[PDB]
Design a protein around this ligand. Structure first.
Ligand SMILES: *[C@@H](C)C1=C(C)C(=O)N[C@H]1Cc1[nH]c(/C=C2\N=C(C[C@H]3NC(=O)C(CC)=C3C)C(C)=C2CCC(=O)O)c(CCC(=O)O)c1C
Ligand SMILES: *[C@@H](C)[C@H]1/C(=C/C2=NC(=C\c3[nH]c(C[C@H]4NC(=O)C(C=C)=C4C)c(C)c3CCC(=O)O)/C(CCC(=O)O)=C2C)NC(=O)[C@@H]1C
Ligand SMILES: *[C@@H](C)[C@H]1/C(=C/C2=NC(=C\c3[nH]c(C[C@H]4NC(=O)C(C=C)=C4C)c(C)c3CCC(=O)O)/C(CCC(=O)O)=C2C)NC(=O)[C@@H]1C
Ligand SMILES: *[C@H](C)[C@H]1/C(=C/C2=NC(=C\c3[nH]c(C[C@H]4NC(=O)C(C=C)=C4C)c(C)c3CCC(=O)O)/C(CCC(=O)O)=C2C)NC(=O)[C@@H]1C
Ligand SMILES: *[C@H](C)[C@H]1/C(=C/C2=NC(=C\c3[nH]c(C[C@H]4NC(=O)C(C=C)=C4C)c(C)c3CCC(=O)O)/C(CCC(=O)O)=C2C)NC(=O)[C@@H]1C
Ligand SMILES: C=CC1=C(C)[C@@H](Cc2[nH]c(/C=C3N=C(/C=C4\NC(=O)[C@H](C)[C@H]4CC)C(C)=C\3CCC(=O)O)c(CCC(=O)O)c2C)NC1=O
Ligand SMILES: C=CC1=C(C)[C@@H](Cc2[nH]c(/C=C3N=C(/C=C4\NC(=O)[C@H](C)[C@H]4CC)C(C)=C\3CCC(=O)O)c(CCC(=O)O)c2C)NC1=O
Ligand SMILES: C=CC1=C(C)[C@@H](Cc2[nH]c(/C=C3N=C(/C=C4\NC(=O)[C@H](C)[C@H]4CC)C(C)=C\3CCC(=O)O)c(CCC(=O)O)c2C)NC1=O
Ligand SMILES: C=CC1=C(C)[C@@H](Cc2[nH]c(/C=C3N=C(/C=C4\NC(=O)[C@H](C)[C@H]4CC)C(C)=C\3CCC(=O)O)c(CCC(=O)O)c2C)NC1=O
Ligand SMILES: C=CC1=C(C)[C@@H](Cc2[nH]c(/C=C3N=C(/C=C4\NC(=O)[C@H](C)[C@H]4CC)C(C)=C\3CCC(=O)O)c(CCC(=O)O)c2C)NC1=O
Ligand SMILES: C=CC1=C(C)[C@@H](Cc2[nH]c(/C=C3N=C(/C=C4\NC(=O)[C@H](C)[C@H]4CC)C(C)=C\3CCC(=O)O)c(CCC(=O)O)c2C)NC1=O
Ligand SMILES: C=CC1=C(C)[C@@H](Cc2[nH]c(/C=C3N=C(/C=C4\NC(=O)[C@H](C)[C@H]4CC)C(C)=C\3CCC(=O)O)c(CCC(=O)O)c2C)NC1=O
Ligand SMILES: CCC1=C(C)[C@@H](CC2=N/C(=C\c3[nH]c(C[C@@H]4NC(=O)C(C)=C4CC)c(C)c3CCC(=O)O)C(CCC(=O)O)=C2C)NC1=O
Ligand SMILES: CCC1=C(C)[C@@H](CC2=N/C(=C\c3[nH]c(C[C@@H]4NC(=O)C(C)=C4CC)c(C)c3CCC(=O)O)C(CCC(=O)O)=C2C)NC1=O
Lengths: 374, 164, 177, 52, 164, 164, 177, 164
């Protein structure tokens, strides 16, 4: 077994996921710290808990008492987040103007760091709402055993890149619900636009259909504005994970050509794989011939120096465990040049480039009526 | 990749400030130590192939049982993979040696190495045999300069202490 | 999450009546074929690790450009996430073998996979190839016809159950494509 | 020529422009390329959203 | 739906592991107890209609005031709903009896029952009168052999302790 | 410790309910499979010492290099620790065999084993050599019953799939 | 985040070979031009708040509809977030001047910005105008040709570096539009 | 205090690692630029009193209205506090100049200065008048060689950009 368990049980999941590359790591006020350390951890908290939302110095006075208590070290960090989420600030950004799906979904993000798994869970937390208010919702999220086990009392919440992911669609959610480093929650939801003068804006929800019914968020929404993208690890995948931008001046001819190309590439692909099984060890009959005539060809070592040995006689020093077959620098260096040389490998990359292009077309062909044809 | 530049930029980004004179002194130190390390990288890209030969040949000089049974070195092809992975690590020592932090050597080689090597029955002791052979074949006077040699020792130290 | 029991129960509630005879008869067959199901899952769970390594290594050996630079098996980290993915897929297939219904596999793991591999840049053709190899390997272990492992069990026909496991793997491979 | 790297070329005027391609995006100076390349027997036409 | 299978699969899913031998022993016990419970389900689908009749007739045999005023049993039609809801509960006893955990009887009958019954002025004591009548009319050695009867007792116990 | 009892008690505790009939059927299955496994545990405590002898002697029969250099088996004393750790694993196979879930074998042997064995340069392949030797050694129709031998196979399978 | 060092390393890993000579030669030019880069970043670290204030004040004065009611610079709070966003753009441009590669600017700040300003209703041409004013002001401070500020430095040609900074501002401007 | 050492130690501490050669290179940069700044600090402690004189005298040379009414410079005593605060800031330029980051000048002078100055009706433009006068006064060859002066200007820049 490669891995023990989920995000909570063990942390092998964090070690070989995207988590290591990201600035999505926990932050701690370590003992007695100066203003530089206090101010760092307090802002990293404000960035996560408000989701890059924008706190003026007037709105900081709302949160100020609690901020001071955390600067002590009297309050644990989870009780600090509790006092952050109970603030009238955090009510005004999120509880005041939101639909319930959107809202509950938010406190999963800011409190737990994860996107909601199923509709049943979402409904459970809504039933906790109608039971005992906003306050006992917040209390229910912070006092959860999964929360305590993952974060502890110290660590500010972060986006957990636990490679387990109960539902893949919940991953696609979790990258969609946080839209990258530039974005914020007011941008993702049109609270600002809807509201007059940058305020009193109702929060819009999307993906409700994906909570209710078995759906999937778009490759666009997960590919354009993402922690996957901000924590980019500079990958030479011939696969581009980035979406190609939508080209202008698209015509239907350009798209029938690409569809036909994709289908031709799929056919050639299946044929080449099926052959690939056929290859076996073509070299193997000759290999077996050489294995047969081994007593003539194989030769024992002469123990000597460079001087005083008959020519073409192997010394025990030049029993290199790569000179024993007769390989070379090439032979260890071969699989790195294999993308161009291999037929099958060459085809797979072409397929994928063709598929990315096909989608980018499927966007662009959608535009109708008023298009300047080219 | 963890380097001087990325640590100070990332730290100033987490700070929420312009890069003050402290980061400027950090990159000043990078451009001070740069020449010594880059001499190391030039010489490594000089004779890397002989480093593959002596490295892997010492690696099977110690452990011969790998060539004995089906386990990890059954064919000549798996021996090609043996020397191949050694050249990956030397190439990552070249990379981190050029960058100057342990960043690419960490995120490309070390990250998730333990699931792979545990999964595919790969012993780490043979790798460590190879690298300890390379650090035993290092002369301060000769080959690369003493300052270059020091940085090469440090990077290869980090390789072993990552694996062991 | 629904077993074969809850599948019969949900169907009977769509019919809006009690349980009756014939549904229970098919469920009786499920109970009596329970030992085979248990031993199948046990066999699959055992040596499960060997199957995953073999499948992904065969994916790389069929198609060498995965291990080549800028393939999705290139970096050591990428090999790690790759092995993990193979392991999780085999894990949920084993759950679907115990449940007898693919509610678990569909709701937990299968749903929203395409967005995940498209959005990461993972090549789909290769992924379905690895699912195919885990399918053949898993059916050979489930039939005790593996070369490297032939353990004694009381002999008998279990083709039903093999077609069931092949159904789940074909569900995954058809889902990633 | 520009995918991955970033190249800086002098124009027909005396001034200079950086041409770069990051994450399948090709931009010349201030404004991004909207249509990629159009062969015209003495070089290429690239199409742009806005006047540099 | 909570059963043996769903609890051990869901628990192993939350664990992040393959199902080990413990879950396998759990489903081994499910396929041990299966026949006794299913005998109970078959006999329930046998004579459920007379269970409706004796159940509801005992339900108004205890409380007569429901037929007296406008409150809960004003018309014969509300009495048809009274019998109707009893048949819903018996159908859920059949369902949870087949599944073997209290899953469908919990999520279909018990979940949110208290806001409804409290809202629409429905007393639970008349339901409990009905179910206590059914557990007092348990013909064990002649009708439901031994353990089929036992499983039926357990399910109907859970119904009353859910409502009370 | 993960067992049937602890999973169903813990699951019902997380549920917030009294233990319903589902958990009762789970422990019913535990008391069904119990005799078969316990026969296995009695025979394991019978001849464990000869299991130490054949296990470790096959473990160095495969890999001889451990006795060769300073690496992991330099002295007779480290070989005493070799046989010793094997007896720890066999004792945990006895314990998990008694409990019937993989609980004590997980929390005592497997948990954090990888940092320790990777730290102290201990190869897993020699353990796996030992255990694979033991799987072959048991004779099902003469030394153990199908149920007892089968459970022994399952537990020791879990040991290898934990380590490899 | 990648500097010039990691850009050479990533390109050499696409080539899947050792760094060698020529790439290191271009990086030696980076090292020898390093102190000019240090003093240039010092010229942008110090005069930034003033540059930000001036650039956004010039943006409002060139386009008076921002201060008009129902504009995005109307409310006092909106002017505050406006000034702060200009400051942050100049901040990541300064990071791109230290790194020598625009991977910090692309990954941290640029990606996710167009869709944000569109989702807020922020006029994009006004933002690109403000980026253009910060570009010209930053090149004038970087060439010591500012009117109100002429600090002494030992003389030398630095046109390469000016084209570099103009490339980053051009890049930021391109992203918004 | 933000310095080279504190940023790289804190960075590696948050990492959970030993300090690799990147922090070491960063640290080397501190001990490279050390001499230029310390020359600056020595000259600052040399004639600081005349810096107070020129600084404050230019500060009231610009704004005369402070001396006019009750507001901020009503008495001679408040003027003594005016020059006193200036000497505080110069002493913090000496401290940050010695540390080499803007650490102590940030945590002792700038942090929370905004609530103080806003509260007590203190105009910041008068401080910035003073500091701008000091930056303007310097002649590099004659007093602070070259780079010592550069470091001094950087620090005082940061004072103004903090206040403005
Ligand atoms: C894991 C260690 C295994 C044990 C133990 C065992 O007995 N065999 C392993 C699992 C196993 N594998 C297959 C099926 C295939 N395995 C393939 C991969 C290899 N084939 C290659 O050419 C290469 C590269 C040189 C590798 C790595 C392939 C391909 C197949 C066949 C695929 C198909 O479409 O059928 C099986 C089933 C066959 C069997 O052994 O009975 C098993 C159990
Ligand atoms: C010094 C403490 C030794 C010793 C040194 C000698 N080294 C010889 C050859 C040799 N050395 C290396 C390692 C070196 N080359 C590299 O490229 C790098 C790192 C990038 C290192 C650390 C190699 C690969 C070789 C073979 C190629 C060559 O000849 O240069 C050497 C010559 C040995 C001989 O020909 O007999 C010597 C003498 N000298 C000593 O006395 C101590 C033990
Ligand atoms: C049956 C399917 C085999 C086989 C069985 C044989 N086993 C022999 C020896 C032996 N077996 C074990 C394992 C056993 N002892 C234990 O204590 C436990 C568990 C607690 C088990 C599972 C051991 C340790 C030994 C060595 C000690 C002994 O001799 O009893 C054996 C004798 C081999 C010989 O002397 O040549 C046999 C024959 N017989 C077969 O045909 C199949 C393969
Ligand atoms: C001089 C150019 C001013 C002005 C100065 C005044 N400052 C007054 C109070 C005050 N000043 C500071 C800053 C100072 N204290 C420190 O600890 C440090 C650095 C470590 C500095 C730079 C503080 C914190 C305070 C409040 C505490 C106190 O009263 O000392 C002040 C008194 C104001 C009042 O009570 O009305 C004055 C007058 N005088 C002027 O005319 C110009 C503008
Ligand atoms: C050079 C670029 C200038 C200029 C320089 C002059 N400075 C004069 C006087 C003066 N300068 C300072 C600042 C200096 N003294 C210190 O103690 C420190 C740092 C610790 C510095 C940076 C002071 C305090 C004074 C007054 C005391 C004194 O006379 O030394 C000066 C004399 C002016 C006069 O008497 O008219 C000059 C000429 N010369 C120039 O042409 C450029 C603008
Ligand atoms: C609960 C179910 C569940 C899954 C099924 C997986 C699915 C999954 N895989 C990845 C992520 C990944 N998956 C793979 C796997 C692949 N490597 C290849 O060469 C092949 C194409 C393929 C194996 C067949 C790789 C390489 C990554 C990392 C991709 C990258 O970072 O570039 C991610 C993103 C998070 C991460 O990096 O781990 C997710 C959600 N995760 C889950 O939680
Ligand atoms: C970026 C860095 C980087 C590495 C360091 C390697 C590490 C590595 N090696 C292998 C894989 C392998 N590595 C070896 C090597 C060995 N043969 C032996 O006899 C020795 C014990 C050892 C050489 C000293 C072998 C034989 C395999 C194939 C194992 C197998 O399929 O059984 C794999 C799995 C994928 C594959 O099959 O290629 C990986 C990730 N790969 C990387 O991407
Ligand atoms: C608690 C754990 C647990 C298990 C792991 C199973 C183990 C198990 N399997 C069978 C019994 C059996 N097991 C199999 C299974 C198969 N035979 C084949 O040739 C195929 C390779 C394989 C397909 C799955 C068969 C065919 C029988 C005999 C037929 C039958 O009993 O239905 C029996 C009957 C008793 C006996 O044989 O002694 C038991 C207890 N039951 C359990 O309670
Ligand atoms: C599917 C499950 C199922 C059951 C468990 C039974 C339960 C049951 N028993 C009776 C009915 C009856 N049950 C009994 C049994 C009893 N005699 C006594 O002395 C003891 C107290 C007790 C046996 C232990 C008697 C005597 C009647 C008839 C009562 C009467 O008519 O007075 C009735 C009414 C219909 C009838 O008259 O048959 C029902 C529904 N029926 C079902 O369909
Ligand atoms: C509760 C379970 C439990 C275990 C399973 C062991 C596991 C274990 N073994 C060792 C330690 C050891 N284990 C071995 C064993 C080996 N010698 C070899 O030649 C083989 C590779 C291998 C036997 C197959 C050796 C030699 C040491 C000492 C290693 C050393 O000091 O170099 C240690 C460190 C403490 C010590 O020195 O004893 C631990 C925790 N201990 C436990 O508490
Ligand atoms: C830690 C922070 C830190 C800095 C901020 C710099 C500051 C600095 N610059 C130079 C040195 C230099 N700086 C410049 C820069 C300039 N070229 C011009 O055309 C413009 C006026 C100006 C860029 C805006 C030049 C040209 C030199 C070399 C001067 C010369 O040798 O003539 C020197 C002397 C050492 C050297 O030659 O590199 C120093 C200390 N160094 C540091 O360590
Ligand atoms: C890391 C990079 C990074 C950025 C580049 C910014 C981008 C950004 N700006 C705003 C938000 C804002 N940005 C502006 C700025 C504008 N005012 C105008 O008159 C002009 C059109 C424009 C300046 C040129 C305003 C006014 C708001 C607040 C909008 C509102 O609430 O109505 C928000 C939403 C959160 C908030 O309110 O602060 C974000 C993410 N934030 C980041 O994290
Ligand atoms: C309560 C919901 C509500 C509104 C919102 C306004 C919107 C509005 N503005 C008008 C028209 C209008 N609006 C402006 C622009 C505006 N005025 C200025 O002097 C400046 C600086 C402006 C931008 C800040 C002008 C210049 C006119 C023309 C009338 C005039 O001379 O002011 C008209 C007249 C339309 C017509 O003539 O048919 C309307 C209805 N009216 C409403 O009932
Ligand atoms: C009435 C509304 C209004 C403004 C506000 C300004 C804003 C402004 N500053 C410019 C450009 C500009 N601004 C400064 C910075 C500035 N100058 C200094 O010497 C010091 C100390 C500064 C900060 C205090 C510099 C250095 C330049 C470059 C031109 C120059 O050499 O001065 C430019 C030219 C832009 C271009 O070249 O495309 C404009 C439009 N203009 C307006 O019409």
């Amino acid at each position: 077994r490669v891995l023990d368990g989920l995000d909570t049980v063990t942390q092998d999941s964090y070690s070989f996921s995207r988590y290591v590359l990201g600035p999505f790591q926990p932050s701690v006020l370590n003992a007695n710290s100066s203003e530089y350390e206090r101010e760092i951890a307090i802002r990293a908290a404000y960035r996560h808990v408000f989701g890059n939302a924008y706190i003026m110095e007037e709105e900081l006075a709302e949160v100020e008492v609690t901020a001071s208590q955390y600067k002590l070290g009297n309050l644990t960090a989870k009780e600090f987040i509790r006092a952050l989420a109970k603030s009238s600030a955090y009510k005004t950004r999120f509880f005041e103007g939101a639909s319930q799906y959107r809202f509950v979904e938010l406190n999963f993000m800011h409190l737990l760091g994860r996107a909601p798994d199923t509709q049943e869970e979402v409904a459970t937390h809504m039933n906790i709402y109608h039971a005992k208010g906003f306050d006992a919702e917040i209390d229910s999220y912070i006092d959860s055993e999964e929360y305590d086990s993952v974060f502890g009392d110290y660590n500010v919440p972060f986006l957990r890149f636990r490679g387990a992911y109960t539902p893949c669609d919940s991953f696609n959610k979790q990258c969609a619900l946080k839209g990258g480093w530039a974005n914020s929650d007011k941008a993702m939801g049109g609270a600002a636009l809807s509201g007059y003068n940058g305020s009193d804006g109702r929060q819009m929800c999307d993906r409700i259909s994906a909570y209710v019914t078995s759906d999937t968020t778009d490759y666009e929404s997960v590919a354009g504005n993402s922690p996957l993208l901000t924590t980019s690890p500079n990958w030479l995948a011939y696969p581009d994970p980035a979406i190609a931008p939508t080209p202008a001046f698209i015509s239907p001819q350009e798209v029938r050509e690409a569809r036909a190309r994709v289908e031709k590439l799929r056919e050639a692909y299946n044929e080449e794989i099926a052959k690939t099984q056929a290859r076996k060890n073509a070299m193997a009959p000759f290999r077996a011939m050489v294995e047969d005539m081994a007593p003539m060809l194989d030769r024992g070592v002469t123990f000597g120096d460079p001087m005083l040995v008959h020519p073409e006689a192997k010394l025990p020093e030049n029993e290199s465990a790569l000179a024993d077959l007769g390989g070379k620098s090439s032979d260890y260096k071969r699989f790195w040049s294999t993308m161009e040389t291999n037929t099958v490998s060459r085809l797979e990359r072409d397929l994928e480039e063709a598929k990315a292009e096909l989608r980018v077309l499927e966007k662009g062909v959608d535009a109708l009526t008023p298009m300047s044809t080219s | 990749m963890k380097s001087v530049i990325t640590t100070t930029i990332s730290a100033a980004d987490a700070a929420g400030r312009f890069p003050s004179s402290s980061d400027l002194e950090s990159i000043q130190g990078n451009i001070q130590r740069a020449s010594a390390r880059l001499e190391a990288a030039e010489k490594l890209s000089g004779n890397h192939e002989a480093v593959v030969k002596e490295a892997g040949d010492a690696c099977f000089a110690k452990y011969s049982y790998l060539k004995n049974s089906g386990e990890a070195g059954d064919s000549q092809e798996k021996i090609n993979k043996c020397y191949r992975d050694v050249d990956h690590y030397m190439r990552l020592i070249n990379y981190s040696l050029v960058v100057g932090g342990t960043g690419p050597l960490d995120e490309w080689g070390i990250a998730g190495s333990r699931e792979v090597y545990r999964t595919l029955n790969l012993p780490g002791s043979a790798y460590i045999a190879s690298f300890t052979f390379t650090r035993d074949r290092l002369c301060v006077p000769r080959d690369m300069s003493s300052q270059a040699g020091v940085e090469f020792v440090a990077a290869l130290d980090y390789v072993i202490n990552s694996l062991s | 999450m629904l077993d074969a029991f809850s599948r019969v129960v949900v169907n009977s509630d769509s019919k809006a009546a009690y349980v009756g005879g014939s549904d229970l008869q098919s469920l009786k067959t499920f109970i009596s074929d329970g030992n085979k199901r248990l031993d199948a899952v046990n066999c699959i769970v055992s040596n499960a690790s060997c199957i995953v390594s073999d499948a992904i290594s065969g994916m790389i050996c069929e198609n060498p450009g995965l291990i080549a630079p800028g393939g999705n098996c290139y970096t050591n980290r990428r090999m790690a996430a790759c092995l993990r993915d193979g392991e999780i897929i085999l894990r949920y297939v084993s759950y679907a073998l115990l449940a007898g219904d693919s509610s678990v596999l569909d709701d937990r793991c299968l749903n929203g996979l395409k967005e995940t591999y498209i959005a990461l840049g993972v090549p789909t053709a290769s992924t379905s190839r690895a699912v195919s190899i885990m399918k053949a390997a898993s059916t050979a272990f489930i039939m005790n016809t593996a070369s490297g492992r032939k353990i004694e069990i009381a002999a008998g026909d279990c083709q039903a159950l093999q077609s069931e496991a092949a159904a789940y793997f074909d569900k995954v491979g058809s889902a990633v494509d | 020529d520009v995918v991955g790297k970033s190249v800086t070329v002098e124009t027909m005027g005396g001034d200079e422009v950086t041409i770069s391609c990051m994450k399948r995006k090709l931009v010349v100076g201030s404004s991004a390329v909207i249509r990629k390349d159009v062969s015209c027997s003495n070089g290429v036409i690239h199409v742009i959203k806005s006047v540099l």
